[PDB]
């Protein structure tokens, strides 16, 4: 889906499989966190479905030894002195010593400030211990978390549930047309993007000799040349668009290991899984009611949340019993208007926009005479190939960008019995729509319930309308205070700040690095996990936020601002928390998840409608839903569901006929599946018989 998803996948630890255990053979004890996972397996990133606890992500600094165990680094403490000597310990090796937490106060020389320090001890025992007892200590605060989990700002303020959802949904982010790095970051974005491998890094230092949208040629210092080719509009495994764009320009000095071109969800080498959106935290006329999201049509007009998706369509021409299927533009009983977009071969031409049902590859298959309906044979007499053309499935629509043809006649090695094979690539530019799923990094998820015009949105004092409205009620229950903090800092990053340096450094910013006392608008900041911005420093920064171009400070020290209702004009009675939040577009879009069926294919054995959207199947009226009908007493609706609407071979056809005739619905018959049941009970030497009121067995 996006580079982070692939990286995490390659760093997975799965408990299932041969030699391990079966899913039915995994109690509540194999799945919960174990005290030895510290610094080795993340306790957060794990699915919440039936595979919870069985699939983990390797910790950041963890490695694997030749034996197979997972080692993690620790700083050796000599005599109450922190040393830069780093040694990797296994689980049992770690238990034989005692380690101090990463965020212990340390002297500039290495001596611990406090005599007592937090220490982890054998058997997963946490307690304070004297400074003269610490043998090792943790390397970094984020030592215990995964790559994705380390990508959550203010992670220390989010509960493990919403944090799990945030880390798991970051892997569901959709690559946008254009990518924007987040204002509020963590530091992990860079290395995540680079080590993911979906960018283009220079192997050896040099200068850019010639750069194009197609490739980038680097002239090294020694004299050699290396050319990196950009992957453009490539279909990902999940339909997302993997598109690389050069960053450097012609004649640019580039060092070794520098990002010269970044791909999907990347900006100057950092993971850009979403966009920075101006957020207001307020209820709005019920359109954002519990977890629904309201968005500004700006995001539609300016393609802020637009994404590219590519589908692969495939068809083959085989040898049949009565001849061979041929791919031809000449299709029986097809107008010249539908075939207007096809080339001479029956293939759609590049650039043509195709709706659902349109022909992409015209293939006809010869059908024998002994397979014709009596009405079909008469219609053939009263007026030998049938239509098997490749049509666009329901719900698909885009520009045809690529075609690939393989012909047995032309040396192309196809499976025995195939003469030709055509693959058509269709690309769709999906704008954000009502019902698409967005989410933040703190398990704060929601669908789009309404996209209002830019003028309807509550706008700030200077006229800038907000971009996204989140309901307030679904905030304090989930215990994801992160977003709140993230919101505040977000604004401080957009506007910048200037701390009063005169009369000394204020008492709150004494611990802030000198690089933070001044920040320009659209500044990039990092809030490392379990370190980073503390609530006090954030309070101060809100106190010293930069003014706008007119010289006015829009948000208060509390972080709230006065908004105007764009529909009525009256300002909202109370100040509202306003900021910038990083929102991602998740891969759960109505364009894919919408489905409906009148009729369609039926399973041959059970004669019940197929399942799944891809097979044009129907929804399953399960057992519980039958209980619902019975509870309502809707007897006729239940019979209808289980007979004429399902597997009544004659009943469903008579229903179709009665609908197109305007007549009434006929009487349901017997389900074919029950006939199958009787035959199956007979196959087990059980004589099942249906008796009438008189007693005679009926056939």
């Amino acid at each position: 889906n996006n580079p982070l998803s692939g990286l995490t996948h390659k760093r997975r630890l799965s408990a299932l499989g041969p030699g391990g255990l079966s899913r039915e053979r995994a109690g509540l004890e194999v799945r919960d966190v174990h005290p030895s996972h510290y610094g080795r397996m993340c306790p957060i990133e794990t699915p919440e479905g039936p595979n919870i606890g069985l699939i983990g992500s390797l910790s950041v600094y963890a490695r694997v030894n030749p034996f197979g165990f997972i080692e993690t680094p620790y700083r050796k403490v000599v005599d109450g002195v922190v040393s830069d000597e780093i040694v990797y310990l296994t689980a049992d090796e770690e238990d034989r010593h005692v380690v101090a937490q990463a965020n212990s106060p340390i002297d500039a020389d290495g001596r611990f400030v406090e005599p007592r320090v937090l220490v982890r001890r054998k058997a997963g025992e946490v307690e304070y211990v004297p400074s003269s007892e610490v043998d090792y200590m943790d390397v970094s605060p984020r030592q215990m978390v995964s790559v994705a989990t380390a990508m959550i700002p203010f992670l220390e303020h989010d509960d493990a549930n919403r944090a799990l959802m945030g880390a798991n949904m970051q892997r569901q982010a959709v690559p946008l047309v254009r990518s924007e790095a987040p204002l509020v970051g963590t530091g992990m974005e860079l290395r995540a993007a680079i080590d993911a491998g979906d960018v283009v890094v220079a192997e050896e230092s040099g200068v850019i000799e010639e750069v194009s949208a197609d490739y980038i040629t680097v002239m090294h210092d020694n004299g050699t040349r290396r050319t990196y080719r950009m992957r453009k509009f490539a279909r990902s495994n999940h339909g997302t668009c993997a598109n690389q764009c050069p960053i450097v320009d012609a004649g640019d000095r580039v060092e070794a290991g520098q990002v010269i071109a970044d791909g999907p969800c990347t900006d100057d080498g950092e993971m850009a899984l979403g966009k920075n959106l101006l957020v207001a935290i307020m209820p709005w006329e019920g359109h954002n009611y519990e977890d629904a999201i309201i968005l500004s049509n700006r995001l539609v007009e300016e393609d802020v949340l637009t994404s590219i998706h590519i589908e692969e369509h495939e068809i083959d021409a085989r040898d049949t019993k009565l001849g061979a299927e041929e791919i031809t533009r000449d299709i029986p009983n097809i107008s010249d208007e539908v075939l207007a977009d096809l080339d001479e071969r029956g293939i759609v031409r590049i650039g043509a926009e195709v709706r659902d049902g349109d022909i992409l590859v015209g293939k006809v298959t010869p059908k024998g005479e002994t397979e014709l309906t009596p009405e079909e044979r008469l219609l053939r007499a009263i007026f030998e190939v049938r239509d098997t053309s490749l049509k666009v499935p329901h719900g698909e629509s885009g520009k045809v960008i690529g075609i690939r043809v393989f012909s047995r006649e032309d040396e192309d090695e196809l499976p025995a019995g195939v003469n030709e094979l055509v693959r058509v690539y269709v690309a769709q530019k999906r704008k954000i729509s009502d019902g698409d799923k967005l989410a933040g990094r703190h398990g704060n998820k929601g669908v789009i319930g309404k996209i209002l015009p830019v003028e309807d949105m509550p706008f700030l004092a200077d006229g800038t309308p907000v971009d996204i409205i989140l309901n307030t009620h679904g905030v304090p229950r989930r215990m994801n205070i992160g977003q709140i903090l993230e919101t505040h800092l977000g604004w401080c990053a957009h506007s910048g700040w200037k701390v009063d340096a005169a009369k000394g450094v204020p008492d709150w910013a004494a611990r802030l690095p000198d690089e933070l006392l001044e920040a320009q608008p659209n500044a990039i900041v990092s809030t490392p996990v379990f370190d980073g911005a503390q609530e006090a420093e954030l309070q101060g920064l809100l106190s010293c936020t930069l003014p706008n171009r007119d010289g006015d400070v829009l948000v208060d020290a509390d972080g709230k601002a006065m908004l105007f209702d764009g529909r009525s004009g009256e300002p909202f009675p109370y100040p509202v928390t306003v900021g910038y939040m990083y929102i991602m577009k998740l891969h759960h879009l109505v364009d894919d998840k919408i489905h409906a069926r009148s009729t369609g294919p039926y399973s041959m054995i059970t004669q019940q409608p197929l399942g799944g959207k891809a097979q044009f199947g129907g929804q399953r009226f399960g057992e519980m839903e039958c209980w619902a009908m019975q509870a309502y007493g809707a007897a006729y609706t239940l019979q209808e569901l289980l007979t004429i609407k399902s597997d009544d071979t004659v009943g469903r056809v008579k229903v179709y006929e009665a609908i197109v005739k305007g007549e009434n619905i006929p009487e349901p018959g017997i389900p074919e599946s029950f006939k199958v049941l009787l035959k199956e009970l007979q196959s087990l030497c059980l004589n099942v018989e249906v008796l009438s009121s008189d007693g005679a067995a009926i056939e």
């Binding site: 950041v60 600094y61 680094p73 700083r75 830069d84 780093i86 990463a102 965020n103 390397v139 970094s140 605060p141 790095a181 970051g185 530091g187 992990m188 860079l190 290395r191 680079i194 890094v201 580039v254 060092e255 290991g257 520098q258 990002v259 100057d268 080498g269 950092e270 611990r511 802030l512 690095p513 690089e515 933070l516 920040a519 500044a523 990039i524 900041v525 990092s526 809030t527 490392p528 370190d531 980073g532 911005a533 503390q534 420093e537």
Partner: peptide
């Protein structure tokens, strides 16, 4: 500064603890 090794954008960190070993 944050991640000063490849030539990346200068992302400023609220970091209080130094990183002895890079990822």
């Amino acid at each position: 500064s944050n991640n000063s090794v490849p030539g990346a954008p200068n992302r400023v960190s609220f970091a209080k603890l130094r990183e002895p070993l890079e990822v």
